[PDB]
Amino acid sequence: SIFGGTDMKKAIACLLFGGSRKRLPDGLTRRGDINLLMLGDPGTAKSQLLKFVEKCSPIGVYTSGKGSSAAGLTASVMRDPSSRNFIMEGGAMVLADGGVVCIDEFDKMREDDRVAIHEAMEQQTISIAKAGITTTLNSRCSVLAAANSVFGRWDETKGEDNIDFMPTILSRFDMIFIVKDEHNEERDVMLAKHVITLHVSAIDLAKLKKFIAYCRVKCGPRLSAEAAEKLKNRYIIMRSGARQHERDSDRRSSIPITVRQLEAIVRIAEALSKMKLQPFATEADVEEALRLFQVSTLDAAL
Amino acid sequence: HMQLYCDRYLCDKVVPGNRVTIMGIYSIKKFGLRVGVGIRSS
Amino acid sequence: TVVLDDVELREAQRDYLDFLDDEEDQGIYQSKVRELISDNQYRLIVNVNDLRRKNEKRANRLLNNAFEELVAFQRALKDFVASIDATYAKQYEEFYVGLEGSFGSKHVSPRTLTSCFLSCVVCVEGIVTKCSLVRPKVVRSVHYCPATKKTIERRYSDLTTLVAFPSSSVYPTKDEENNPLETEYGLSVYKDHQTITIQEMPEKAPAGQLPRSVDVILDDDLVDKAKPGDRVQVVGTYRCLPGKKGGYTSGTFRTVLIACNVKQMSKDAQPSFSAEDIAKIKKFSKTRSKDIFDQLAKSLAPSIHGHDYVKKAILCLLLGGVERDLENGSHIRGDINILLIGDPSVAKSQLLRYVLCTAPRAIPTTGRGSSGVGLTAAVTTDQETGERRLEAGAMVLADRGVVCIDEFDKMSDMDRTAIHEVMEQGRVTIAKAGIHARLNARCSVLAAANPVYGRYDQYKTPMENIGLQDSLLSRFDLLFIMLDQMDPEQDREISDHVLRMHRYRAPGEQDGDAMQIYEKHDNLLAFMKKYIHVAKIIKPVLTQESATYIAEEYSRLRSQDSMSSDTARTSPVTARTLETLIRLATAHAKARMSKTVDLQDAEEAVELVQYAYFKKVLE
Amino acid sequence: SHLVKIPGIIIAASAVRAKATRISIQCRSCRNTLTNIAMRPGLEGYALP
Ligand SMILES: Nc1ncnc2c1ncn2[C@@H]1O[C@H](COP(=O)(O)OP(=O)(O)O)[C@@H](O)[C@H]1O
Ligand SMILES: Nc1ncnc2c1ncn2[C@@H]1O[C@H](COP(=O)(O)OP(=O)(O)O)[C@@H](O)[C@H]1O
Ligand SMILES: [Mg+2]
Ligand SMILES: [Zn+2]
What we know:
Chain A has helices spanning 6-17, 46-56, 92-95, 111-120, 167-170, 185-201, 205-218, 225-249, 259-276, 283-297, and strands at residues 22-23, 29-30, 36-40, 60-64, 76-79, 86-89, 99-104, 126-128, 135-137, 141-147, 175-179. By secondary structure, chain A is α/β, with parallel strands linked by helices.
């Protein structure tokens, strides 16, 4: 029920199943989820996709950066002096543990939330240590974050400058799409057709969410060595290209492409092969993952 | 409002905030028998 | 109304006397009795899986009906410890039986401590909330009448759970002739008594729901085994209480959990060894003592590539230096503190989570998660006595432990200065008008800051590029700079490592569904904890050669000529840097189990600082 | 005291605690028990004998 945005639909598809967590024989932890950033214009259905994805996840919470009406964003714990119990206000992050948070207005977030989210996103906790206690809450959540660029839309003159988020919160992500509706007469007239078609017309949702939970609980997708070697080759090529664009522009790129992004492709491939519940994802799956990643990288090299 | 009294397997089946359709028995307390009289806590 | 015999009690006592009788078996419970007799401790901890395997029916009976069953157990214990030593068994009017093991269905949480488990020894994890004053309770009270030169001993039965009568609760004060009786406090007998409150852990508890807690009555033997905030597993008898007398009752029966034992649920005080493991550590030390630090350093933190100097430094932290408290209490600290500053996606937070999972008593502190009063301690009134109590903070909890500071850059200046005396002297001197104290937090700090601008600019100096004062960077004793060089060659290195670890699986245990000194050398790739734990205790003194060499190298570092032009200092060389040299030397020697810090460790320390501190800013 | 079904929204929930259904008492002189007294259900106390 949204016109186009086909890469974004497939991205949401991969997001909803997410990767596969790794606890290693030493003890460290690596995430098994995917983050989707959706920078761009007002007109496109960014908040509407956020709305649907919250509806369609098994457990998911769609909030603003500025907390929520009588609900925070991160968790907090506070002593109660009368009864001495450490009451635990549950934010979106913990109230949708094991789930999909859909943050909106990620640009416009609290500073305390910014810090706790830097800890929380790629590594799955929210630590809090009040006067008496020292907790470490469990926050297993996949992020669908929207935002507008500062200057209303994406002006071409401010490319590599028209984003206000920090690189140390674009690092955490696994694919970051910009959305601008610049010059497409046919697309826009067809879009008018599409939206009023929705207006007049108004698998299945329940089946899809059940299937999502089913894949996530049943299969652990984990790539094969040939797929790993292909990803290695394209990773060196991608990082060389990012370095090349950096030195060409002579100013440091406004969006990291890192080992986090390597592992983002790994998680994306795992989720894709989770769509078929095959515990060895194929080089074809990793190729389509790189395709989605290049459609994410359209802005970085740009 | 209404004070509600659960029982063995009606306990902890509902968490604060969950709307319910709940089937039970209206009753007044019985603990041994304010400008009003004959008004026990229902 | 003395009972002549009961088949139930006789049977149960016979069964548990057999269970304690361990000679034809390996001697485990006999050894437990002998060691507790040697200790003077008077509780013996019997594993429920042992009881179940030797007699499942008795385990079912006991875990369904505790108190009388444990009376049988404890009478058997008294008879048994009397046979081993009658003299010691006579010493204590009772001996007790703690529990342990797999309380399978009998492991719930205070949210799930329903009314099905009454008089059943329940197992429950949770966080303490309160610590009532541990106050005496009289058990056998002696009196003296001076008019009649008389002595009496009134006797009390611990009916904390059963029905209690005034005739049992009388405290005598006059004789039959209405004379005055004077209590004999010393000749009387008392047992401590404390109440505490376990709570469902917020990490375990439901996200959006209020806490739920259970009351726990620790009598003697369990006085100070649980303070507020601690993680504790309590196993014991949920029961009902008697309402005090009165012709009416509502049905309410406020319930408790008379704990049978409580253990530290952290499960990080784990020195569990065997003599074979001790010999293993001893040979591991002595055979290759000179390369052992590099062995450990390369070993530590697998599932990450390179950063070998940082692994060496985190070893220097975890192994620790040696605290020094001189003649007049001038306490010179013996902890390392490391500041990871580096580009994003450099596994800094992964190192932090590694030390969280490994180092005992490790605790995480976020930038604006924890804040000041949370970080260090606090003073607050009781409101039940109008008296000022002290609430130990994160650092004080982490006394003789580790704190992992995520996003150290984001702590505001108030807290960044509040950490000062814990950073240097490892104490927090707190005070308000009623109460003052110097809480002791001999902590160690591994802190992962991030650079200004969100990523290090190579050409800019480190002091410009770090948003942190020289004041604090003095107190930190090492500052390690982690750059993402972005070269394809080292990218191939890191990438192959990372994807190998993405390919590593639970060996054999998994099929496709998601959730010894040396290691079996898995191509795709415990004793760490054992060895570093034993390593912490040694106090390797500095040799004259090491002290002179470390002194001269420090003088060289202070002199400006030691840094060439085009390099920029990352931390000014105050005398804290010399003490850093000594502490890192001691940590290396402790790795070697040296018993003396030698020139090898000294030159390793100087190598460490020379790489860590002076940075080559490029043009 | 009829059978009523209603719609509502919970806004809190006290703890799960222990109310009795059978209670045995015993005398203070002869210690004879009077076991198995039918304690009533709901909020309804019971004056002791
Ligand atoms: N492609 C589209 N087709 C139909 N309706 C759309 C489309 N894009 C946006 N809309 C409408 O615009 C409204 C607001 O868009 P929104 O979801 O807030 O995205 P943004 O946050 O970028 O404005 C939605 O309620 C939706 O009905
Ligand atoms: N030195 C390294 N060796 C192997 N993998 C690394 C290294 N540095 C970063 N990574 C990868 O990049 C990711 C970065 O995660 P994290 O450490 O949480 O963020 P940051 O590095 O910004 O603190 C890790 O999941 C890890 O897989
Ligand atoms: Mg929006
Ligand atoms: Zn009587």
